[PDB]
DUF2169 domain-containing protein
Amino acid sequence: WDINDHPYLNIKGRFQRDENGDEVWVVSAKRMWSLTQNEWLSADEVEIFDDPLYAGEPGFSAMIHDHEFAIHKHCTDVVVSGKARAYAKRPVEQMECRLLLDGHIDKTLVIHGQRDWIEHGGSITVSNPQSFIDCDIDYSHAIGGEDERNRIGGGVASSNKVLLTQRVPSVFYPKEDWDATSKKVRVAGFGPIPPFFKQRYQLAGTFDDNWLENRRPLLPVDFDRRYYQSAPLDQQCKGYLQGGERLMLSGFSHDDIFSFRLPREKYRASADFGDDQEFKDLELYTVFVDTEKGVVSLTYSAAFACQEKEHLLKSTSIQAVV
């Protein structure tokens, strides 16, 4: 059952550099389940992503998905790409979207209809929401703007003039809405956290003059491997998912809730660096729910440190654990 060329997993490996500049062989294995077709897609139809994908300019637009070769994650990320879709296609002015993963995640966000700014003697507020059937809910609709928490959002500006060129944010946690005091309103969404969000790039450490002169080429001393997690913090699981957990999403389909139960198969990888055979358990690093396509992607990963014997890598095989 030791399969280099696996019959249902798509498997890909990339070398990465760790925070000391040392090479790491990262093996990622991926499965996709069609919620519509109720079947696993064949490995040929499964793509493991070498690079992040952005909606617009990289670094200035919502991140659709991150790359899949993190050297380490301490828990499973769960991320959603989809739209708010009102029940039965009845127009509404606001609705709730909920991500439920038993034991790990229970998250509701409130989605508002589109709104306009209302100016009044140098004071600005928001109009009533417009009715909608479906809408986008990515971080360009979250609080942000002139704000390192989310520089692609709206509602945070240094002047009324700038504020009026921004989109009124529409995605919030329950009991929160836009207020002029921006830091009291959380950035909200279900999608992956772009590295240019302060909550993430802060974890990469301080690239200051001290670093430039005395630490480089190493990463900064305050680099934190949590930087590799791409889910929102309340969508990071309690450790790694083990199989059998139930996932439920409501508000992303007009007609029904999405429901998915994780497979129980677990995997072990083996990498051959010459005469040295190495074994590491894969863990589930990412659960990516695309409700527009009706697919759930599952990416498993393991990382083999190989600064000693880079060129000596012969083979990598993955076998299911019985």
Summary: Residues 10-320 form one domain. The longest strand covers residues 23-34. The two ends are 10 Å apart (CA to CA).
